[PDB]
RNA sequence: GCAGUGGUGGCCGAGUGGUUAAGGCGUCGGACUUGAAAUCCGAUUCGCUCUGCGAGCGUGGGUUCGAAUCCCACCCACUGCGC
RNA sequence: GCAGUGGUGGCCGAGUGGUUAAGGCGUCGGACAUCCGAUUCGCUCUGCGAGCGUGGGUUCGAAUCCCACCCACUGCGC
């Protein structure tokens, strides 16, 4: 959510920038005008409610002192108590009406405000078609070589995938992962966790469901219907399975005043993610590439909002991911996502798209995003530990970046390291593999 | 351990049904004609020799020796109706030389179809092993009354420690030397002493009773195995 | 479920033995008598329904023949119907239809009743089970390993905080009662446990398998119990409605992996090392030392699962082998324990026998169950229709495989045991078998960085 | 998530409104042959009061005297989309 | 899951039907290791309004009394 002072010309804001940003994101620029009218009506309503409450409190104080609507305290003391009770009834009716109006206005304003996106970084490519305007920033490796099989055949040739029985047990896209591919996924988790731990990240295993009252503050409405599973206990709770470990990690510091001294707070989230959308786009998107359930390792950073430090940390996060994939030998290019396909919180996003030689396509493996103070002010995570008198608080900056989604990274490893006799084990995962699987994952079945 | 005692009772009460369904599923194609009969027994060699074939099956034991020697009248006994119908529909069948009839050799009596002390030779070729060990002397006595007082009874059947006995899994065992096949028919593997003391208890006299050894070999699977049949001849006392 | 022929006395059955077993489990006898009468009635109803179906079939065949020969226009026999016009045979078909419909209703009712009586009768008991209903008194201790009387200062409830590896309050804010964040050194320790357990089981010949966490209701019914499926399982709901249930253990999806199959007897001892996150809804606190990460809603578990031959006492040898695997695991981890044989009244319906490994917690002064090894014989395979051979015999009935399961390592509880047993005054000593899988710097000691919450 | 084609027995695969669910392949047992076999004969979903009858062709239903064949829904695949 | 007591501000702690939510301890700033000021949200800001787990009720008036839920702790179930 944006600062409501950005929409108030009275304060040092102006809604013209917000309208031009709503245009850059190719969203509705008309939400800003509705928001401004709702906010300007709400300020009147709130002022009137405070004056009514003031009169009520003065009536109560007069009654209390005597027992032991232009009404001054002096003009009120010269009355009997029954008269004050009549006045209190009048005040109560007025307060009821005003509170109805104010609740309506608050709901309207917050409805128009949760659909306005963060300000954009001047580096974002302004466009709406992703396939042409996404700015490729740097290449690494050989992103043109092509090899025999795609991952959809390779996961079966090594006998590490059970799709039919998984769809019998769990349904569309359900899967069992078995044998050598469980060991490879565990090796990936170990290597990613050690890489991030050496950099100063704190590993954190999160809860897999979250209360709805908390999930609202970290997710959007689009996500709940479209992508979030709902968990039902006994007595019919309202919990949701997490779509990413960024959601619980964000709520780990909600309603806190962080000390500026400890602010580069970096966490390496480890969890299982649950998505509903698994829509397919050909054979090369089947297998374990788009599934409902997968393990993911995340980078989550809380940063100071000052001195451009947030953007330096953004560069550092994407560099950490890049080095992870260079040490694995996966060729990729870094892409600057266009402003049309950004979520509301993101002010800039970089995707790492790996080359798949058996599929002949670039596939997204890492997504790095800087949401600045969009979610910090919704969760009320404040930068300083002390507030100044007559000075609004500053919120921390929050950045998240995927380090390794294990299924997709396994697909990329299989497609990039396939030989005629099996899959070569990447040099950096050999120490985390069992003996017997430290040089080659052998083919044991034919390709379907 | 052994087969359920309830199941062994079901096997005994359904013996005829099990043999009948065998002839239903297998027709006359399971067993092959026995051409070794005439050579094996000194009887049956080359006047009017009346014969009883207990457990005639679909033939396979009397049609060979009956087209070989043309002065033999034959009685045929079998408790399965399907086997009798197959014997009758055989083109080599003629009533002037054969008299087939159904008779459960344990329950029914042979005098209802053959005259007493008339048959001069009766054959028991792989028939007694299908009978429960406690109802065999019933068969021996049932055929004791139709044998001429100087005639004999010819017997070949499984013997102890034959390979077929050793192929049977432990879940197919009804008792000592007593097994059951997948189709419900049973197999008892006789010993010389058991058969001797079973024939002596019903009024017979032993002449020859000794094992016959063979082997089975499938070259393609290179399987050669031992086989142990027990051949014998018992004779009804003259006087 | 049990074999229905165990109750038919006209077959080789004996319901008296089922009554004795239902008494030894301290369950309700007379359920056997209700079952026997419902089954004996269902058999007659099935006979009658088959006969009505035969008459309807014969009517339809006769009608077809009349029509294809171009005809000019319930003690029934074949020849009897051959002397009626088509209209009359249709008149008869209407009566057949009415009778068939009422018989079908009666049969469906009898089937449902017999089944709801059958699903509440427990498996036969192994003769080694101690017959009792008091778990605290009669649970038989079989073996003891290590020193199970030593005492140490802190319980796991303090130790998880003194190492700064546990977030309970924020977890309960995020997920609710019992939610938790595991962080820092305890994430590395959990991962080390998973690596060590998977490597051990893989060297023993188990196939590591990562299961799905959502099971469908149609399949979960066949692997779970009434009480569990009622109050113990979370329900998942997507867009639409939603028949999915979060698994309470990996034994549930792995059981449904060979569902409705004819397994070759060769390769029959299939061993699976299941790895998943388990979601249990029942978390009751019996004191302070059961809080922390001991009883939680979500945790990772490594499971043993074996499909075995039903012959030659092979599943019981496999049972001993599985409990031995778990024992050797915890002996290499250096954790003291005793093995207990659970009493009849505490086994669930599928188990014929259950062994438990109970680890000694020196900081709590108690025994806590870490491993649970069960032999459920063919009780579940019959429900899932997992046959023992590839070919069905001519006359014999189909035989089913035996299915055994045993927890290898529940990560939270094992972490609690390691923390309590390896605490020193300066931190937690790392077990020698887990130092391979720990990061550098965490291979000798996990230092205390916070004070004890009790102090 | 749409808007098309599909789903047969352990597997492959025929199937045409009146099957005996063909043919194979795999598996499993039985073998008594003197003219033994470098093979032959069979069995192989569920149910019942079993030499037979009933049910079953993804799962449920409908139309028809009759469906594995025609219709619908759902589920799961594959091909195109949305995401 | 039920049957007993509980839930105060960044922290801890007083708080009785009428508070400036007291005192401390942090922290920030200023003055020169002490002192002073500030240190939840809102507003048309030097003052008013709201907030004492979260919602409601009773009362002129509730942090205080009642109820529901949530989360704890103490016993039971399991
Ligand atoms: N108790 C009994 N009474 C009459 N026949 C019997 C019998 N027990 C078994 N049988 C018959 O004996 C036959 C054995 S098969 C052997 C048939 C014959 N010996 C031949 O050489 O071909 C079976 O067909 C069975 O029908
Ligand atoms: Mg098929
Ligand atoms: Mg066929
Ligand atoms: Mg159907
Ligand atoms: Mg406090
Ligand atoms: Mg104060
Ligand atoms: Mg309150």
Short mmCIF file of N, CA, C and O in Angstrom, two decimals, chain C residues 137-237:
data_model
loop_
_atom_site.label_atom_id
_atom_site.label_comp_id
_atom_site.label_asym_id
_atom_site.label_seq_id
_atom_site.Cartn_x
_atom_site.Cartn_y
_atom_site.Cartn_z
N UNK C 137 0.70 -49.70 32.56
CA UNK C 137 1.03 -50.77 33.48
C UNK C 137 1.57 -52.00 32.76
O UNK C 137 2.58 -52.57 33.18
N UNK C 138 0.93 -52.41 31.68
CA UNK C 138 1.20 -53.71 31.09
C UNK C 138 2.02 -53.65 29.81
O UNK C 138 2.33 -54.71 29.26
N UNK C 139 2.37 -52.47 29.32
CA UNK C 139 3.24 -52.37 28.16
C UNK C 139 4.55 -53.07 28.46
O UNK C 139 5.26 -52.71 29.40
N UNK C 140 4.88 -54.09 27.68
CA UNK C 140 6.03 -54.93 27.96
C UNK C 140 7.29 -54.30 27.39
O UNK C 140 7.36 -54.03 26.19
N UNK C 141 8.27 -54.07 28.25
CA UNK C 141 9.58 -53.61 27.80
C UNK C 141 10.39 -54.80 27.33
O UNK C 141 10.57 -55.77 28.07
N UNK C 142 10.87 -54.74 26.10
CA UNK C 142 11.62 -55.84 25.50
C UNK C 142 13.12 -55.69 25.69
O UNK C 142 13.77 -56.58 26.25
N UNK C 143 13.68 -54.59 25.22
CA UNK C 143 15.12 -54.36 25.27
C UNK C 143 15.38 -52.97 25.80
O UNK C 143 14.52 -52.09 25.77
N UNK C 144 16.60 -52.76 26.30
CA UNK C 144 17.06 -51.46 26.75
C UNK C 144 18.46 -51.25 26.21
O UNK C 144 19.29 -52.16 26.23
N UNK C 145 18.73 -50.04 25.73
CA UNK C 145 20.06 -49.69 25.25
C UNK C 145 20.47 -48.36 25.86
O UNK C 145 19.69 -47.41 25.87
N UNK C 146 21.68 -48.31 26.38
CA UNK C 146 22.22 -47.08 26.91
C UNK C 146 21.87 -46.86 28.37
O UNK C 146 21.37 -47.74 29.08
N UNK C 147 22.14 -45.64 28.81
CA UNK C 147 21.87 -45.21 30.17
C UNK C 147 20.56 -44.42 30.17
O UNK C 147 20.51 -43.30 29.67
N UNK C 148 19.52 -45.01 30.74
CA UNK C 148 18.19 -44.41 30.74
C UNK C 148 17.80 -43.84 32.09
O UNK C 148 16.61 -43.68 32.37
N UNK C 149 18.77 -43.52 32.94
CA UNK C 149 18.50 -42.92 34.23
C UNK C 149 19.26 -41.63 34.50
O UNK C 149 19.01 -40.99 35.52
N UNK C 150 20.19 -41.24 33.63
CA UNK C 150 20.96 -40.02 33.84
C UNK C 150 20.05 -38.80 33.73
O UNK C 150 19.03 -38.81 33.02
N UNK C 151 20.39 -37.75 34.46
CA UNK C 151 19.64 -36.50 34.44
C UNK C 151 20.54 -35.36 34.00
O UNK C 151 21.75 -35.36 34.26
N UNK C 152 19.95 -34.39 33.31
CA UNK C 152 20.67 -33.22 32.83
C UNK C 152 19.82 -31.99 33.06
O UNK C 152 18.64 -32.07 33.38
N UNK C 153 20.43 -30.82 32.87
CA UNK C 153 19.87 -29.59 33.42
C UNK C 153 18.60 -29.17 32.70
O UNK C 153 17.52 -29.13 33.30
N UNK C 154 18.69 -28.86 31.42
CA UNK C 154 17.58 -28.24 30.71
C UNK C 154 16.79 -29.26 29.91
O UNK C 154 17.33 -30.25 29.42
N UNK C 155 15.50 -29.00 29.77
CA UNK C 155 14.67 -29.75 28.86
C UNK C 155 14.70 -29.09 27.49
O UNK C 155 15.17 -27.97 27.33
N UNK C 156 14.17 -29.80 26.50
CA UNK C 156 14.22 -29.29 25.14
C UNK C 156 13.49 -27.97 25.00
O UNK C 156 13.84 -27.15 24.14
N UNK C 157 12.49 -27.72 25.85
CA UNK C 157 11.71 -26.49 25.77
C UNK C 157 12.58 -25.28 26.03
O UNK C 157 12.34 -24.20 25.47
N UNK C 158 13.59 -25.41 26.88
CA UNK C 158 14.55 -24.34 27.09
C UNK C 158 15.67 -24.37 26.07
O UNK C 158 16.11 -23.33 25.59
N UNK C 159 16.12 -25.57 25.72
CA UNK C 159 17.28 -25.70 24.86
C UNK C 159 17.03 -25.17 23.46
O UNK C 159 17.95 -24.65 22.84
N UNK C 160 15.80 -25.28 22.95
CA UNK C 160 15.57 -24.76 21.61
C UNK C 160 15.63 -23.25 21.58
O UNK C 160 15.86 -22.67 20.52
N UNK C 161 15.44 -22.59 22.71
CA UNK C 161 15.53 -21.14 22.76
C UNK C 161 16.94 -20.69 23.09
O UNK C 161 17.42 -19.69 22.54
N UNK C 162 17.64 -21.41 23.96
CA UNK C 162 19.01 -21.03 24.29
C UNK C 162 19.94 -21.09 23.09
O UNK C 162 20.99 -20.44 23.10
N UNK C 163 19.60 -21.86 22.05
CA UNK C 163 20.39 -21.90 20.83
C UNK C 163 19.86 -20.96 19.77
O UNK C 163 20.47 -20.85 18.70
N UNK C 164 18.75 -20.27 20.04
CA UNK C 164 18.15 -19.32 19.11
C UNK C 164 17.75 -20.01 17.81
O UNK C 164 18.10 -19.58 16.72
N UNK C 165 16.99 -21.08 17.94
CA UNK C 165 16.60 -21.83 16.77
C UNK C 165 15.11 -22.03 16.69
O UNK C 165 14.63 -22.86 15.93
N UNK C 166 14.36 -21.26 17.47
CA UNK C 166 12.94 -21.52 17.61
C UNK C 166 12.21 -20.21 17.80
O UNK C 166 12.65 -19.35 18.58
N UNK C 167 11.11 -20.05 17.09
CA UNK C 167 10.27 -18.86 17.19
C UNK C 167 8.84 -19.34 17.41
O UNK C 167 8.17 -19.76 16.47
N UNK C 168 8.38 -19.28 18.65
CA UNK C 168 7.07 -19.77 18.99
C UNK C 168 5.98 -18.72 18.96
O UNK C 168 4.90 -18.96 18.43
N UNK C 169 6.25 -17.55 19.54
CA UNK C 169 5.23 -16.51 19.60
C UNK C 169 4.91 -15.98 18.21
O UNK C 169 3.74 -15.84 17.84
N UNK C 170 5.94 -15.68 17.42
CA UNK C 170 5.70 -15.22 16.07
C UNK C 170 5.09 -16.31 15.21
O UNK C 170 4.27 -16.03 14.34
N UNK C 171 5.46 -17.57 15.47
CA UNK C 171 4.83 -18.66 14.76
C UNK C 171 3.34 -18.76 15.05
O UNK C 171 2.54 -19.01 14.16
N UNK C 172 2.96 -18.55 16.31
CA UNK C 172 1.55 -18.58 16.66
C UNK C 172 0.82 -17.37 16.13
O UNK C 172 -0.39 -17.42 15.90
N UNK C 173 1.52 -16.25 15.96
CA UNK C 173 0.88 -15.11 15.31
C UNK C 173 0.65 -15.41 13.83
O UNK C 173 -0.38 -15.02 13.27
N UNK C 174 1.57 -16.11 13.20
CA UNK C 174 1.45 -16.37 11.77
C UNK C 174 0.51 -17.54 11.50
O UNK C 174 -0.41 -17.43 10.68
N UNK C 175 0.71 -18.66 12.18
CA UNK C 175 -0.05 -19.87 11.89
C UNK C 175 -1.10 -20.19 12.94
O UNK C 175 -2.10 -20.83 12.62
N UNK C 176 -0.91 -19.72 14.17
CA UNK C 176 -1.89 -19.99 15.23
C UNK C 176 -1.33 -20.93 16.27
O UNK C 176 -0.11 -21.18 16.24
N UNK C 177 -2.18 -21.46 17.15
CA UNK C 177 -1.67 -22.29 18.26
C UNK C 177 -0.67 -23.33 17.75
O UNK C 177 -1.04 -24.08 16.84
N UNK C 178 0.54 -23.34 18.31
CA UNK C 178 1.56 -24.37 17.97
C UNK C 178 2.35 -24.03 16.70
O UNK C 178 3.30 -24.78 16.42
N UNK C 179 2.00 -22.98 15.96
CA UNK C 179 2.85 -22.67 14.82
C UNK C 179 4.23 -22.27 15.29
O UNK C 179 4.42 -21.76 16.39
N UNK C 180 5.22 -22.51 14.44
CA UNK C 180 6.58 -22.20 14.84
C UNK C 180 7.43 -21.94 13.61
O UNK C 180 7.17 -22.47 12.53
N UNK C 181 8.43 -21.10 13.79
CA UNK C 181 9.52 -20.94 12.84
C UNK C 181 10.70 -21.69 13.42
O UNK C 181 11.05 -21.50 14.59
N UNK C 182 11.28 -22.58 12.63
CA UNK C 182 12.57 -23.14 12.98
C UNK C 182 13.64 -22.35 12.25
O UNK C 182 13.51 -22.07 11.06
N UNK C 183 14.69 -21.95 12.96
CA UNK C 183 15.63 -21.04 12.32
C UNK C 183 17.06 -21.36 12.73
O UNK C 183 17.30 -22.03 13.73
N UNK C 184 17.99 -20.89 11.92
CA UNK C 184 19.39 -20.92 12.26
C UNK C 184 20.00 -22.29 12.34
O UNK C 184 19.99 -23.04 11.37
N UNK C 185 20.55 -22.63 13.51
CA UNK C 185 21.28 -23.87 13.67
C UNK C 185 20.36 -25.08 13.65
O UNK C 185 20.82 -26.18 13.36
N UNK C 186 19.09 -24.91 13.96
CA UNK C 186 18.20 -26.05 14.01
C UNK C 186 17.65 -26.42 12.64
O UNK C 186 17.17 -27.53 12.47
N UNK C 187 17.73 -25.51 11.67
CA UNK C 187 17.43 -25.88 10.29
C UNK C 187 18.55 -26.74 9.73
O UNK C 187 18.31 -27.75 9.07
N UNK C 188 19.80 -26.37 10.03
CA UNK C 188 20.93 -27.19 9.61
C UNK C 188 20.90 -28.55 10.27
O UNK C 188 21.22 -29.56 9.64
N UNK C 189 20.49 -28.62 11.54
CA UNK C 189 20.44 -29.90 12.23
C UNK C 189 19.33 -30.78 11.70
O UNK C 189 19.51 -31.99 11.54
N UNK C 190 18.17 -30.20 11.41
CA UNK C 190 17.10 -30.98 10.79
C UNK C 190 17.53 -31.52 9.44
O UNK C 190 17.29 -32.69 9.12
N UNK C 191 18.18 -30.68 8.63
CA UNK C 191 18.63 -31.15 7.32
C UNK C 191 19.69 -32.23 7.46
O UNK C 191 19.72 -33.17 6.67
N UNK C 192 20.55 -32.12 8.47
CA UNK C 192 21.54 -33.16 8.71
C UNK C 192 20.88 -34.48 9.06
O UNK C 192 21.30 -35.54 8.60
N UNK C 193 19.84 -34.43 9.89
CA UNK C 193 19.10 -35.64 10.23
C UNK C 193 18.47 -36.26 8.99
O UNK C 193 18.50 -37.48 8.82
N UNK C 194 17.88 -35.44 8.13
CA UNK C 194 17.26 -35.97 6.92
C UNK C 194 18.30 -36.62 6.01
O UNK C 194 18.09 -37.71 5.48
N UNK C 195 19.44 -35.96 5.83
CA UNK C 195 20.49 -36.54 4.99
C UNK C 195 20.97 -37.86 5.56
O UNK C 195 21.11 -38.85 4.83
N UNK C 196 21.22 -37.91 6.86
CA UNK C 196 21.74 -39.12 7.47
C UNK C 196 20.73 -40.26 7.38
O UNK C 196 21.10 -41.40 7.06
N UNK C 197 19.46 -39.98 7.63
CA UNK C 197 18.46 -41.02 7.59
C UNK C 197 18.25 -41.53 6.18
O UNK C 197 18.13 -42.74 5.96
N UNK C 198 18.18 -40.63 5.20
CA UNK C 198 18.02 -41.06 3.82
C UNK C 198 19.21 -41.88 3.36
O UNK C 198 19.04 -42.87 2.66
N UNK C 199 20.42 -41.49 3.76
CA UNK C 199 21.58 -42.25 3.34
C UNK C 199 21.60 -43.64 3.97
O UNK C 199 21.90 -44.63 3.30
N UNK C 200 21.25 -43.73 5.25
CA UNK C 200 21.18 -45.03 5.91
C UNK C 200 20.16 -45.94 5.24
O UNK C 200 20.45 -47.08 4.89
N UNK C 201 18.94 -45.43 5.06
CA UNK C 201 17.89 -46.26 4.48
C UNK C 201 18.23 -46.63 3.04
O UNK C 201 17.94 -47.75 2.61
N UNK C 202 18.84 -45.72 2.29
CA UNK C 202 19.22 -46.04 0.93
C UNK C 202 20.28 -47.12 0.87
O UNK C 202 20.27 -47.96 -0.02
N UNK C 203 21.23 -47.10 1.81
CA UNK C 203 22.22 -48.16 1.82
C UNK C 203 21.61 -49.50 2.22
O UNK C 203 22.08 -50.55 1.78
N UNK C 204 20.57 -49.49 3.05
CA UNK C 204 19.90 -50.74 3.39
C UNK C 204 19.09 -51.32 2.24
O UNK C 204 18.64 -52.46 2.34
N UNK C 205 18.86 -50.56 1.17
CA UNK C 205 18.07 -51.03 0.06
C UNK C 205 16.71 -50.40 -0.10
O UNK C 205 15.94 -50.84 -0.95
N UNK C 206 16.38 -49.39 0.70
CA UNK C 206 15.12 -48.69 0.53
C UNK C 206 15.21 -47.71 -0.62
O UNK C 206 16.28 -47.19 -0.93
N UNK C 207 14.08 -47.45 -1.25
CA UNK C 207 14.00 -46.49 -2.34
C UNK C 207 13.47 -45.18 -1.76
O UNK C 207 12.33 -45.15 -1.29
N UNK C 208 14.26 -44.11 -1.75
CA UNK C 208 13.75 -42.84 -1.25
C UNK C 208 12.64 -42.35 -2.15
O UNK C 208 12.72 -42.43 -3.37
N UNK C 209 11.57 -41.85 -1.54
CA UNK C 209 10.42 -41.42 -2.31
C UNK C 209 9.81 -40.21 -1.64
O UNK C 209 9.54 -40.21 -0.44
N UNK C 210 9.62 -39.16 -2.42
CA UNK C 210 9.05 -37.91 -1.94
C UNK C 210 7.59 -37.90 -2.37
O UNK C 210 7.28 -37.93 -3.56
N UNK C 211 6.71 -37.89 -1.42
CA UNK C 211 5.32 -38.14 -1.73
C UNK C 211 4.57 -36.84 -1.91
O UNK C 211 5.00 -35.78 -1.46
N UNK C 212 3.43 -36.87 -2.59
CA UNK C 212 2.54 -35.72 -2.58
C UNK C 212 1.91 -35.53 -1.21
O UNK C 212 1.87 -36.44 -0.38
N UNK C 213 1.53 -34.29 -0.89
CA UNK C 213 1.03 -34.02 0.49
C UNK C 213 -0.50 -33.96 0.49
O UNK C 213 -1.09 -33.99 1.58
N UNK C 214 -1.10 -33.85 -0.69
CA UNK C 214 -2.58 -33.86 -0.79
C UNK C 214 -3.02 -35.24 -1.27
O UNK C 214 -2.57 -35.65 -2.34
N UNK C 215 -3.86 -35.93 -0.50
CA UNK C 215 -4.41 -37.22 -0.98
C UNK C 215 -5.89 -37.00 -1.29
O UNK C 215 -6.52 -36.21 -0.56
N UNK C 216 -6.41 -37.66 -2.31
CA UNK C 216 -7.83 -37.51 -2.59
C UNK C 216 -8.66 -38.31 -1.58
O UNK C 216 -8.18 -39.27 -0.97
N UNK C 217 -9.92 -37.91 -1.41
CA UNK C 217 -10.76 -38.56 -0.41
C UNK C 217 -11.04 -40.01 -0.78
O UNK C 217 -11.05 -40.88 0.09
N UNK C 218 -11.28 -40.28 -2.06
CA UNK C 218 -11.55 -41.65 -2.49
C UNK C 218 -10.42 -42.58 -2.12
O UNK C 218 -10.65 -43.74 -1.75
N UNK C 219 -9.18 -42.10 -2.19
CA UNK C 219 -8.04 -42.94 -1.88
C UNK C 219 -7.69 -42.90 -0.39
O UNK C 219 -7.22 -43.89 0.16
N UNK C 220 -7.92 -41.76 0.27
CA UNK C 220 -7.59 -41.67 1.69
C UNK C 220 -8.49 -42.56 2.53
O UNK C 220 -8.04 -43.10 3.54
N UNK C 221 -9.74 -42.75 2.12
CA UNK C 221 -10.64 -43.65 2.84
C UNK C 221 -10.07 -45.06 2.95
O UNK C 221 -10.26 -45.73 3.96
N UNK C 222 -9.36 -45.51 1.92
CA UNK C 222 -8.87 -46.88 1.89
C UNK C 222 -7.60 -47.08 2.71
O UNK C 222 -7.24 -48.23 2.96
N UNK C 223 -6.92 -46.01 3.12
CA UNK C 223 -5.68 -46.13 3.87
C UNK C 223 -5.80 -45.58 5.28
O UNK C 223 -4.86 -45.74 6.06
N UNK C 224 -6.92 -44.96 5.63
CA UNK C 224 -7.09 -44.33 6.93
C UNK C 224 -8.23 -45.00 7.69
O UNK C 224 -8.88 -45.93 7.20
N UNK C 225 -8.47 -44.51 8.89
CA UNK C 225 -9.49 -45.01 9.80
C UNK C 225 -10.60 -43.98 9.94
O UNK C 225 -10.47 -42.83 9.51
N UNK C 226 -11.72 -44.41 10.52
CA UNK C 226 -12.87 -43.51 10.69
C UNK C 226 -12.51 -42.32 11.58
O UNK C 226 -12.74 -41.17 11.20
N UNK C 227 -11.96 -42.59 12.76
CA UNK C 227 -11.65 -41.52 13.71
C UNK C 227 -10.64 -40.54 13.13
O UNK C 227 -10.82 -39.32 13.21
N UNK C 228 -9.55 -41.06 12.56
CA UNK C 228 -8.54 -40.19 11.96
C UNK C 228 -9.14 -39.35 10.84
O UNK C 228 -9.12 -38.12 10.90
N UNK C 229 -9.72 -40.01 9.84
CA UNK C 229 -10.36 -39.33 8.72
C UNK C 229 -11.43 -38.35 9.17
O UNK C 229 -11.79 -37.45 8.40
N UNK C 230 -11.94 -38.49 10.39
CA UNK C 230 -12.99 -37.60 10.87
C UNK C 230 -12.40 -36.35 11.51
O UNK C 230 -12.68 -35.24 11.07
N UNK C 231 -11.57 -36.53 12.54
CA UNK C 231 -11.14 -35.41 13.36
C UNK C 231 -9.64 -35.15 13.31
O UNK C 231 -9.18 -34.20 13.95
N UNK C 232 -8.87 -35.96 12.59
CA UNK C 232 -7.42 -35.81 12.64
C UNK C 232 -6.83 -35.22 11.36
O UNK C 232 -5.67 -34.81 11.38
N UNK C 233 -7.59 -35.16 10.27
CA UNK C 233 -7.05 -34.76 8.98
C UNK C 233 -7.55 -33.38 8.60
O UNK C 233 -8.74 -33.09 8.72
N UNK C 234 -6.63 -32.53 8.15
CA UNK C 234 -7.00 -31.27 7.54
C UNK C 234 -7.58 -31.49 6.16
O UNK C 234 -7.19 -32.40 5.44
N UNK C 235 -8.51 -30.63 5.78
CA UNK C 235 -9.14 -30.69 4.47
C UNK C 235 -8.65 -29.51 3.64
O UNK C 235 -8.60 -28.38 4.13
N UNK C 236 -8.27 -29.78 2.40
CA UNK C 236 -7.78 -28.76 1.49
C UNK C 236 -8.88 -28.42 0.49
O UNK C 236 -9.61 -29.30 0.05
N UNK C 237 -8.99 -27.15 0.14
CA UNK C 237 -10.02 -26.68 -0.78
C UNK C 237 -9.38 -25.73 -1.78
O UNK C 237 -8.78 -24.73 -1.39
#
